[PDB]
Design a protein around this ligand. Structure first.
Ligand SMILES: CC(=O)N[C@@H]1[C@@H](O)[C@H](O)[C@@H](CO)O[C@H]1O
Ligand SMILES: *[C@@H]1O[C@H](CO)[C@@H](O)[C@H](O)[C@H]1NC(C)=O
Ligand SMILES: *[C@@H]1O[C@H](CO)[C@@H](O)[C@H](O)[C@H]1NC(C)=O
Ligand SMILES: *[C@@H]1O[C@H](CO)[C@@H](O)[C@H](O)[C@H]1NC(C)=O
Ligand SMILES: *[C@@H]1O[C@H](CO)[C@@H](O)[C@H](O)[C@H]1NC(C)=O
Ligand SMILES: *[C@@H]1O[C@H](CO)[C@@H](O)[C@H](O)[C@H]1NC(C)=O
Ligand SMILES: *[C@@H]1O[C@H](CO)[C@@H](O)[C@H](O)[C@H]1NC(C)=O
Ligand SMILES: *[C@@H]1O[C@H](CO)[C@@H](O)[C@H](O)[C@H]1NC(C)=O
Ligand SMILES: *[C@@H]1O[C@H](CO)[C@@H](O)[C@H](O)[C@H]1NC(C)=O
Ligand SMILES: *[C@@H]1O[C@H](CO)[C@@H](O)[C@H](O)[C@H]1NC(C)=O
Ligand SMILES: *[C@@H]1O[C@H](CO)[C@@H](O)[C@H](O)[C@H]1NC(C)=O
Lengths: 595, 139, 210, 140, 595, 210
């Protein structure tokens, strides 16, 4: 019949006070003693103290002394418990218990229904979201990659964990963990297991971890456990001839390795097939300063090298192995030593014909005998050192196993005519030094108006079997350039049918030059009325151009009728016949025997 | 269409006057210009020789000599449209021969030589035998 | 916090099995055990060491051997699940949580590890996680090993409720350390032992070189 | 497509006997050319007077040509290349190639022969008058 | 006679309460009102409230409302003041004051002796020690180095600062600062001035700063300021000719500086002596890990250079300054590896002209770049190594600045024709390795004999009565060596009267060449019937020589019809002559017969 | 914190000089001045603004000019040094600390600067110190300069007791800032002005490059 009746639940605030009643029935109140016990989740039950209804004697616990007060009403058979200065840690279920018998109060067999007391707030600190990534790439058959999101500094315990993709798609493979209290604050973590194929093929670089809390919702990006992949090579660095003065004739060689994402590498030095570990100092692999993109790193390696074997040209190869692949490099050689130089550099000046026809003054620097074409650089510089624009062109991989390059620059006619000096500068990785040339215009020249004569093949020497050869002789022109062209039937013939020679100087007529131009015909079309002209264009000519002509016939100055061609046969025949008649009449005369 | 109607050649002697013409049918204000082009499908620009003097673009080359041989071509153009170009007038030069007798052709000289031969033979044969018979008959 | 210490903090047993809860007291006084169902108030089951309370079934029986007291139930029931706490005078024990455990085939827990985040390490302390998901056996000995030195005191484990469908639990061990002490070691491991593994798992990670 | 016709030489002057060629860079697939002849610059008839011997005209599908092997003095004139273009009813025409056949006997020879012929003619006339006068006075 | 008597001092703890009595005498207690004033050090005086003895009326201050209780006894003429919930901030001296007159209680002229109350005087929080190092290197007679130690997070006020060296020697030149309270915690600093000589020469790198507090003593080492000075070693490294890559081919230079003491260094890259800062990358300065000696520092600067710029011989300089001392190092693509003594040696072979004129094939090893001519030896070694008798003569003066000498040896014609290996060895004492030059002519070039056609001067040329130009055209000779020389009567014309062209390839037939020769004859030596013979010599000709003759009236214009015309006129003229003569004879005879 | 303002936070005067203390009140009410000797209780010297109390020597005299009141003593004595504060009804001033100052030759304060320690910055906030040892004339105007921006409020001065032998005072101004605010500047200076110099000292330091 003994039963304990308690008051209802109450929601209090920090600093306030709570009061709970404990009605006892079915037994003598002044006989048994009542005690108050509070049971909080995650903690052992705590006895707040016992109260004696007879006389009001009470005994409160040391931890609750000064804040807990116990009273009771003998007539009403009800006990009271007052707890002032409530806090967040005081939130628990308050129940009143009585001993099974009056002799032993510790045997709490009868207990009340309990009056929960909730104390909201007190700290009010929102959780902070921290991303969690897998630390070890497990070598097992893991078809999914594990990622996590850790929430810390949460004063209360109420967190809802959600995971969403970049496309706002919710992740259903989420696994939450129980909240853990650390230093008066609750910490909770959530993990989401996403498929490896989805991470390796999806364009979403990170997952969105959403945590909902009463003090404010928080979101944090969770990057996937992936990195870039391309690190692998290195470069070597030699010191100069002056650089070997560490003491007696010593220096160090430097190898640099960069463009490395995945950290795992191995650095080593080799010399003619043996691993070198002497004087080798390896630095850490630090991160390159990149605003965005791959997280490639960089490292420099150093060997304290000696010059004695460097004079012996002992090799040094710097290698690294990354992503299961080995890279290689071995610094040596005396800056591409000699006995391997074969390059032809021709600086072609602009002719007068090209200037007067195409109106452009294009300096040209033809380079041949090349073995490769990666490093060649042709630069046209003016006389005063100011570089002129140039447009290199590499093509025509000749059967001679060499490549040809040309760099053409355009200049104004005024500067070229003034006598300025232009210097082609060819530089290449197979050369020890730049290969300079120079062209200019010989301003100190005169004009002397060449004379063009066109010659027949040969009186009867060439013209006996085939293949005649007519020459166009040009003599006397002073300014050392000319341009002869051959035409046949009103049309320019072909540049590959005739050969014109350079303006060589002359026999005794100082100051002027001469040239030639031969053309070859088949001689079945020479005694067949064909006509060839030789058009010669020179600067000193009155019209800057002229032309001559030979066909098969020398010349003539008559009208073909004022030479008496149609009557001469008649005159010859009549005079023969009448001379014979006179030679018969003379005898008839001389024979007369006149008395 | 005044092209195709210009003479195909001009005959002139060294140290003499050469008169060209450009007989266009345009509206009596066209800018005539006289050029000197090469033979056929050339590649070099023509030699501007100046406008016509005045009447109908006539060109007057004076003291003609051996350098002046070539094709001469007008380029009549009215207003702003494209020029229309004469075909050419090949100027050729030579020194004309004189002749002491009254030049009497050449075939005429051969014909007269033959005629005089015949006449001379007959005037030799007839009187000769005539007077040789007469004397012998007289004797 | 008190002299009375309860050995089994939690007990995952199926209906029909025997649940044993031990509590050793280092002081003179009668020891009593009370069972508190979820929501309901605690009910006295065993009093004075081995004397059964009124209405207590004969299945639950307590035994005392010197200072150690053990309460063993010979027949798990629907109403026998709950929280059992030992009380000595005014002091109460940490309690024992008896929970149902659905039987299933023994599986292998995928052992994982999470290093401290860059943002977390820069501001304040650092937490080292150790995820063990898809585990059929609830019992597991997850011991943190940093530079082959067994840590004790700074570890914090967490086990989620058994999955309704797969009947598998997940265990996460978060090792909370300071930024000024976590940099002294680089070899961090979580020795995870379970019935589904022939040998203990040694999933480790190296600081720096990742 | 009917491009303009142009004819290569504007003036040919050769000694008699030698061949002569005249080229007419027509348009290819527009029609067969046909040369014409014009003794002066007034009006041109067709030169169907091409004997199978001397004149013969051909066509290289982009260049039509006419060759006159035996050049004699009666060949002077202007030779055109009227081609009946087949896109409309009109005919193009290249402009002329004046052939003036020259002759042998360079100027010095001409002068010497003229002086000698003049001497012969004067001598013969003197003999004519002498032979007509002498018998009449002798037979007085 | 008015005097106020207060109770004795009391030492309380947090949470407890204090009670103070204030007895008044010499005046009517119920007449004047008593007030309570507490004086806390470092703070303004605070009035706790006033109490009226008549009726017990009191008025406590708002800040102390609820925690202050005022009581008094009219019969005993004594007042009471109770302050519950005492804290550390309540530690002050409580005094009772009375007004000078009953009308104005504010003019407190009579005050009691006071009752000081100490609440938890001992420091609870342990101080935090952080060493303090001088930040500015004062250059104004800094004969003493100032080092400090900062103590923070200390409760109340109890700190004792002591400074000792590594050798446990106490420092007497210590100057501490007054305690400052910030954020509820006291902060104190201690400073000590050490001699410059002791810091510079002492073996102690740090001093021991001892702080004594009631909550526990703490020690913090303060590093000794100012270190030694070392010169920064400078190194510059360059890539070899194989270290360039990328479409805009580029590589790196490194200026690695080490041994710069204090904390600082500057590094700059200069292009051709002009400052440049494009592409320069300098790593952050870092200390070198050394187990002993002063802490040395390292830095590496990186510059990127294009291969076009690097191969352009332009100078690249690293300019570094340290403690006001500037250092520079230069690097550029300079090799100059070979010796500058006589190196360029040409072994000119015997031309065909030489074989045709001198009747012996001679080898000519000509040494150039020669600076001294007392030890040079020239020897000609054949294919089998045997030598033949060479000859020497050394050029003098400065034909090409340097001197030169000639080595010549005559060998049989068949030896050269067979194309055996021939070598000339040049040896000089200045040359460590005797340079060897080789020459041979074994080939399979065919022997196509030339064709010599001789052309008379053009008719247009002779009309000017100035000069005439005769061409001896040689065409179709397969080896490219020919020898043309003219002949006037029987003796060769002097070689300045003709110019012979170089052999050029023939376009008509590949693998065959042609050449011209030009003689000028002054239009009267041609017009007076002289003859000219062009004597061509070549390998494939029958007896190594041919000759063509052209002498004014040879042949020319054929014109068969023209010759028929001339013969017809000649016939007509002769028959006219004969006819006229026959007429003369007939007429003379018949006039003789008539007379 | 109150309406009563006591500008004389410190007073370094020698026996014989005149000490001037001001107290501005922004409320209606009589103003009184009290003197508190070391250890002894406060004593009323001036009451009702300018009325002398009993036993007050004629050397001390108070004056009132609108809201500002001035209490000046014309003759410093051994017993005239102490703590003087103004009182207005229940509100009192901060007090004036009058202390003896032995006269000596004007000295030059050796100005220095201490950057925050690496360990101090790693854990919490940072402190910028500036010590001026061996300085005569305790009055000194030390103004912290961070990137030529005169700070106000975040500074904290500290002056040691006058040396018995050298009669020189040492003043140190510790400027405390936060780690998230100290990284926005690198040019830190403390402008120290005194009678012994000609132009105020500007001993500065640059963070990072040391
Ligand atoms: C192993 C490797 O890749 N490095 C080689 C090195 O051993 C060798 O000396 C050099 C030839 O000089 O070619 C490179
Ligand atoms: C080089 O010449 C070719 C033609 O052969 C042309 O296509 C190319 O653009 C040229 N390259 C230049 C001018 O850089
Ligand atoms: C090809 O190379 C040969 C030499 O190997 C050279 O003689 C020739 O001129 C080259 N061809 C060219 C430049 O077209
Ligand atoms: C006439 O035409 C020529 C040809 O283009 C031109 O150069 C010249 O300026 C013109 N003269 C005028 C329009 O007066
Ligand atoms: C002139 O010759 C050039 C050379 O290619 C050609 O393209 C052009 O068509 C020719 N002109 C005529 C009108 O045939
Ligand atoms: C117009 O006609 C002819 C063109 O050849 C010319 O002779 C004549 O002088 C010209 N006269 C005028 C006024 O243009
Ligand atoms: C005509 O004059 C002389 C005469 O021979 C000649 O030299 C000149 O070139 C010719 N042309 C001109 C324009 O004088
Ligand atoms: C002729 O053509 C030119 C084209 O530039 C134009 O500017 C001009 O106005 C035209 N003439 C007239 C009269 O409009
Ligand atoms: C075109 O002219 C040629 C030349 O006579 C002739 O052979 C040919 O048949 C002509 N074409 C046609 C379609 O009649
Ligand atoms: C000098 O050298 C020339 C050839 O350069 C040679 O003919 C001559 O014999 C040499 N003189 C002597 C004395 O050897
Ligand atoms: C002189 O010039 C250079 C000098 O190095 C040399 O190559 C050249 O052959 C020398 N000339 C003669 C004629 O010896």
């Amino acid at each position: 019949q003994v039963q304990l009746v308690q008051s209802g639940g109450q929601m209090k605030k920090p600093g306030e006070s709570m009061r709970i009643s404990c009605r006892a029935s079915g037994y003598e109140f002044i006989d048994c003693t009542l005690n108050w016990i509070r049971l909080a989740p995650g903690k052992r039950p705590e006895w707040m103290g016992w109260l004696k209804p007879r006389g009001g004697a009470v005994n409160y616990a040391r931890p609750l002394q000064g804040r807990v007060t116990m009273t009771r009403d003998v007539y009403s058979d009800t006990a009271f418990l007052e707890l002032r200065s409530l806090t967040v840690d005081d939130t628990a279920v308050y129940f009143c218990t009585r001993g099974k018998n009056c002799d032993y109060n510790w045997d709490f067999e009868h207990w009340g229904r309990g009056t929960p007391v909730i104390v909201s707030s007190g700290s009010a600190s929102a959780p902070t979201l921290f991303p969690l990534v897998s630390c070890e790439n497990s070598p097992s058959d893991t078809s999914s990659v594990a990622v996590g999101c850790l929430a810390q500094d949460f004063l209360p315990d109420s967190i809802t964990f959600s995971w969403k993709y970049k496309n706002n798609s919710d992740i259903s493979s989420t696994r939450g963990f129980p909240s853990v209290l650390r230093g008066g604050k609750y910490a909770a973590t959530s993990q989401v297991l996403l498929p490896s194929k989805d991470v390796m093929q999806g364009t979403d670089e990170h997952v969105v971890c959403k945590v909902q809390h009463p003090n404010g919702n928080k979101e944090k990006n969770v990057p996937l456990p992936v990195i870039a992949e391309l690190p692998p090579k290195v470069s070597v660095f030699v010191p100069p001839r002056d650089g070997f003065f560490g003491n007696p004739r010593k220096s160090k060689l430097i190898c640099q390795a960069t463009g490395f994402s995945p950290r795992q590498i191995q650095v080593s030095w080799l010399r003619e097939g043996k691993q070198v570990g002497s004087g080798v100092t390896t630095d850490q692999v630090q991160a390159e300063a990149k605003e965005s993109g791959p997280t490639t790193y960089k490292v420099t390696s150093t060997l304290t090298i000696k010059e004695s074997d460097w004079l012996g040209q002992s090799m040094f190869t710097c290698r690294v192995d990354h992503r299961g692949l080995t890279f290689q490099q071995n610094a040596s050689s005396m800056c591409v030593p000699d006995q391997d130089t074969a390059i032809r550099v021709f600086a072609i000046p602009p002719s007068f014909a090209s200037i007067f026809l195409t109106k452009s003054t294009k300096l040209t620097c033809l380079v041949t005998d090349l073995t490769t074409y990666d490093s060649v650089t042709i630069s046209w510089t003016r006389q005063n050192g100011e570089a002129v624009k140039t447009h290199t062109n590499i093509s025509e991989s000749h059967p001679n196993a060499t490549f040809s390059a040309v760099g053409e620059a355009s200049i104004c006619e005024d500067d070229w005519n003034s006598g300025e000096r232009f210097t082609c500068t060819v530089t290449h990785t197979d050369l020890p030094s730049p290969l300079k040339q120079t062209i200019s215009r010989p301003k100190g020249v005169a004009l002397h108006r060449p004379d063009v004569y066109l010659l027949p093949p040969a009186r009867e020497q060439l013209n006996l079997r085939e293949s005649a050869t007519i020459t166009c002789l040009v003599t006397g022109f002073s300014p050392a350039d000319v341009f002869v062209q051959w035409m046949q039937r009103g049309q320019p013939l072909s540049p590959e049918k005739y050969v014109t020679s350079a303006p060589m100087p002359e026999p005794q007529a100082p100051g002027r030059y001469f040239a030639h131009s031969i053309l070859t015909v088949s001689e079945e079309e020479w005694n067949t009325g064909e006509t060839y002209t030789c058009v010669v264009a020179h600067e000193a000519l009155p019209n800057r151009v002229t032309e001559r002509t030979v066909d098969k016939s020398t010349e003539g100055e008559v009208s073909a009728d004022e030479e008496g061609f149609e009557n001469l046969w008649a005159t010859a025949s009549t005079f023969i016949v009448l001379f014979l008649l006179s030679l018969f009449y003379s005898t008839t005369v001389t024979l007369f025997k006149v008395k | 269409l005044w092209m195709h109607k210009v003479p195909a050649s001009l005959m002139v002697s060294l140290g003499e006057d050469a008169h060209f013409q450009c007989p266009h049918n345009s509206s009596n204000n066209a800018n005539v210009t006289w050029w000197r082009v090469l033979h056929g499908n050339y590649t070099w620009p023509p030699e501007f020789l100046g406008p016509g003097e005045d009447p109908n673009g006539t060109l007057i080359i004076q003291n003609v000599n051996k350098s002046h041989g070539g094709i001469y071509v007008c380029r009549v153009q009215e207003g702003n449209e494209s020029y229309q170009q004469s075909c050419g007038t090949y100027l050729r030069v030579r020194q004309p021969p004189p002749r002491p007798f009254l030049d009497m052709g050449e075939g005429t000289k051969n014909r007269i030589i033959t005629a005089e031969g015949i006449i001379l033979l007959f005037c030799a044969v007839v009187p000769g035998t005539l007077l040789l018979f007469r004397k012998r008959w007289q004797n | 916090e008190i002299v009375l210490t309860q050995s089994p903090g939690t007990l995952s047993l199926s209906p029909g099995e025997t649940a044993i809860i031990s509590c050793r007291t280092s002081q003179y006084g009668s020891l009593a055990w009370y069972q508190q169902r979820p929501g309901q108030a605690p009910r006295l089951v065993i009093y004075s060491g081995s004397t059964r309370a009124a209405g207590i079934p004969d299945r639950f029986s307590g035994s005392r051997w010197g200072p150690d007291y053990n309460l063993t139930i010979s027949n798990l029931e629907s109403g026998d699940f709950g929280v059992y706490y030992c009380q000595q005078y005014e002091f109460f024990g940490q309690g024992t949580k008896v929970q149902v455990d659905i039987k299933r085939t023994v599986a292998a827990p995928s052992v994982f590890i999470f290093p401290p985040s860059d943002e977390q390490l820069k501001s304040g302390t650092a937490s080292v996680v150790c995820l063990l998901n898809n585990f059929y056996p609830r019992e597991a000995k997850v011991q943190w090993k940093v530079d082959n030195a067994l840590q004790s005191g700074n570890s914090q484990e967490s086990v989620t409720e058994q999955d309704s469908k797969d009947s598998t639990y997940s265990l996460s061990s978060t090792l909370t350390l300071s930024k000024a002490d976590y940099e002294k070691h680089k070899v961090y491991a979580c020795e995870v032992t379970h019935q589904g593994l022939s040998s203990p798992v040694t999933k480790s990670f190296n600081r720096g070189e990742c | 497509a009917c491009s303009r016709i142009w004819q290569s030489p504007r003036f040919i002057a050769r000694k008699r006997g030698f061949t002569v060629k005249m080229h007419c860079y027509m348009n290819s697939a527009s029609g067969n050319v046909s040369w014409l002849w014009k003794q002066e610059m007034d009006e041109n008839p067709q030169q169907l007077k091409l004997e199978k011997g001397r004149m013969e005209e051909s066509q290289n599908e982009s260049l039509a040509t006419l060759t006159i092997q035996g050049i004699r003095f009666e060949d002077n004139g202007i030779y055109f290349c009227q081609q009946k273009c087949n896109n409309t009813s009109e005919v193009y025409q290249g402009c002329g190639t004046e052939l003036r056949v020259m002759g042998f006997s360079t100027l010095a020879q001409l002068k010497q022969r003229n002086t000698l012929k003049d001497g012969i003619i004067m001598i013969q006339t003197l003999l004519i008058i002498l032979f007509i006068i002498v018998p009449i006075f002798l037979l007085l």
